[PDB]
Amino acid sequence: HHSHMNQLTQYTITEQEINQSLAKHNNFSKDIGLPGVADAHIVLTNLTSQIGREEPNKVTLTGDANLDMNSLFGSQKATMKLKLKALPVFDKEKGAIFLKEMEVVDATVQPEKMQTVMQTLLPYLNQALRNYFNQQPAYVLREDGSQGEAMAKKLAKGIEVKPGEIVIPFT
């Protein structure tokens, strides 16, 4: 019965909850690189997370990107599979979890000639990613959801990353 808080001492956010939230909040569509030389517009979709399985305190993400790579002489479409890693950090003020310092762990690009361009543009993509996800939270605690979530917002004593899920202690 919904009148009883599942958990009384903490609140838990699963990989699946983070994924659905990202699916809502992730609208990453940015320009990366050097206009007129190697300048890509990149849209990131389908971000799926893995919580705290490698580095105990870090999160991993897989996603797809579509790119339009541009130069003064033309453009070419590219697609990309990415693996990313980030550091979840809780902002008490906003009652929100941010995936900070996001960077590309591995990437595969098609077509082939776009492979070397993207390797060069990697640090630009890293910049766009961490600027985007440093300010767009991955998860925001609401007051009009479960009572547990309401209580996390009010009491949250930071977060703790465990295998498979993010825990927000009330204590």
End-to-end Cα, the chain, rounded Å: 25
Smallest distance, Na ion to C-beta of residue 128, A:
4
Smallest distance, Na ion to C-beta of residue 43, A:
15
d(CA 63, CA 7): 32
| Choices 60-68, 89-97, 125-133, 143-151 (CB under 5 A): range interacting with Na ion | 125-133
* By CB under 5 A, residue 131 contacts Na ion: yes
* By CB under 5 A, residue 128 contacts Na ion: yes
d(CA 171, CA 157): 6
Site for Na ion, residues 55 to 114, rule: CB under 5 A: none
Nearer to Na ion, 119 or 131 (CB): 131
> Which SS3 state, helix, strand or coil, does residue 26 take?
coil
Q: Where are the alpha helices (DSSP H) in 13-112?
A: 15-25
| Choices 60-68, 102-110, 119-127, 138-146 (CB under 5 A): range interacting with Na ion | 119-127
Smallest distance, Na ion to C-beta of residue 78, A:
19
> Which SS3 state, helix, strand or coil, does residue 73 take?
coil
61's tokens? 């993400």
Smallest distance, Na ion to C-beta of residue 156, A:
29
Smallest distance, Na ion to C-beta of residue 99, A:
16
Nearer to Na ion, 13 or 47 (CB): 47
d(CA 148, CA 3): 11
| Choices 8-16, 20-28, 129-137, 160-168 (CB under 5 A): range interacting with Na ion | 129-137
125's tokens? 């993509």
Q: Residue 84 to residues 31, 87, 136: CA-CA distances in angstroms? A: 18, 11, 16
Query: Which chain residues interact with Na ion by CB under 5 A?
Result: 127-128, 131
